[PDB]
From a paper:
[name] is a housekeeping enzyme that is present in all kingdoms of life. It maintains the cellular energy homeostasis by catalyzing the reversible Mg2+-dependent interconversion of ATP and AMP to two ADPs. [name] ([name]) [name] has three subdomains: a core and two flexible substrate-binding subdomains, denoted ATPlid and AMPbd. The latter two domains fold onto the core region upon substrate binding, thereby leading to an overall more compact conformation.
Here, we explore how [name] ([name]) from [name] interacts with diadenosine tetraphosphate ([name]), a putative alarmone associated with transcriptional regulation, stress, and DNA damage response. Instead, modeling of two ADP molecules explains the observed electron density considerably better. Thus, we conclude that two ADPs rather than one [name] molecule is bound to [name] in the crystal. Considering that neither ADP nor other mononucleotides were added for the crystallization, the source of ADP is attributed to [name]-mediated hydrolysis of [name]. The rate of [name] hydrolysis by wild-type [name] was determined with 31P NMR to kcat ≈ 5 × 10–6 s–1 with Mg2+ present at 295 K (pink). We excluded nonenzymatic hydrolysis, since [name] was stable over at least 2 weeks under the experimental conditions in the absence of the enzyme (black). The slow [name] hydrolysis by [name] [name] suggests that it is likely a side reaction so far not characterized. On a much slower time scale, [name] hydrolyses [name], and we suggest that the dynamically accessed substrate-bound open [name] conformation enables this hydrolytic activity.
Author numbering: 1 to 214
The structure:
């Protein structure tokens, strides 16, 4: 099974991707997580990406496409994968289509801007692993600590309020057109398309996605 999750930054995609990976046994392919890992490792890609992500801008399509191409060639993706934050632009979607990669489900998260801004304020990450929490809506079991390692949680540099505003503007300009892109693919019979109300509690969105995916 192959899935794309579509939605604004902060819509809840990475949170729900964890549950899908656990139940359906397919890896989460998050280009944000992979780019942050490149920074953490000090790879050449990481050297290029850090300043761009910190500014709330998109990394070049050609670099991200190559990153995803290599990732999905790895053994753990042989039987499917979940794309989370990719494709992010029409050229990224066209590259995957040109490559001959169809997906089985495209799942769109419907969340208004007003809620995203307010919501991202509380996002906390365990920076080494990428595990994601919210101080209120999905808190760690011990305040400020990762559930697995007990290490202190951090705030992402690009989650600062002014950067979030910029990121959202760019989402609507560059990324929201993928809604029509994959709606059209579904009309052609190339994928199934569904939209979930991502303003509901985490558990309710999870149940809605479980009903769609079986
Ligand atoms: N597919 C992509 N194309 C270009 N840049 C990307 C892509 N995925 C992630 N990024 C970069 O990583 C940043 C953070 O993205 P992401 O981790 O998906 O955060 P969020 O879930 O808040 O949108 C983006 O603002 C961009 O700089
Ligand atoms: N349904 C929800 N209601 C409230 N908060 C949520 C929900 N889903 C996720 N969150 C929290 O809001 C923030 C953004 O969720 P995240 O999964 O990181 O979104 P994305 O991957 O789309 O950027 C995180 O801090 C997360 O814990």
């Amino acid at each position: 099974m192959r899935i794309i999750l579509l939605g604004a930054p902060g819509a809840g995609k990475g949170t729900q991707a964890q549950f899908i990976m656990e139940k359906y046994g397919i890896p989460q392919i998050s280009t944000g997580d992979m780019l942050r890992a490149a920074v953490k490792s000090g790879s050449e890609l990481g050297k290029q990406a850090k300043d761009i992500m910190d500014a709330g801008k998109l990394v070049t399509d050609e670099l991200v496409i190559a990153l995803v191409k290599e990732r999905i060639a790895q053994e753990d993706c042989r039987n499917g994968f979940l794309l989370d934050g990719f494709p992010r632009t029409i050229p990224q979607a066209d590259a995957m289509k040109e490559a001959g990669i169809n997906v089985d489900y495209v799942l769109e998260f419907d969340v208004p801007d007003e809620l995203i801004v307010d919501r991202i304020v509380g996002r906390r990450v365990h920076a080494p692993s990428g595990r994601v929490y919210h101080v209120k809506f999905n808190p760690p079991k011990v305040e400020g600590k990762d559930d697995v390692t007990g290490e202190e949680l951090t705030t992402r540099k690009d989650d600062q309020e002014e950067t979030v505003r910029k990121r959202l503007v760019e989402y609507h300009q560059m990324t929201a057109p993928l809604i029509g892109y994959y709606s059209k693919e579904a009309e052609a019979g190339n994928t199934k398309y569904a939209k979930v109300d991502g303003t509901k509690p985490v558990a309710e969105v999870r149940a809605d996605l479980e009903k769609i995916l079986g």
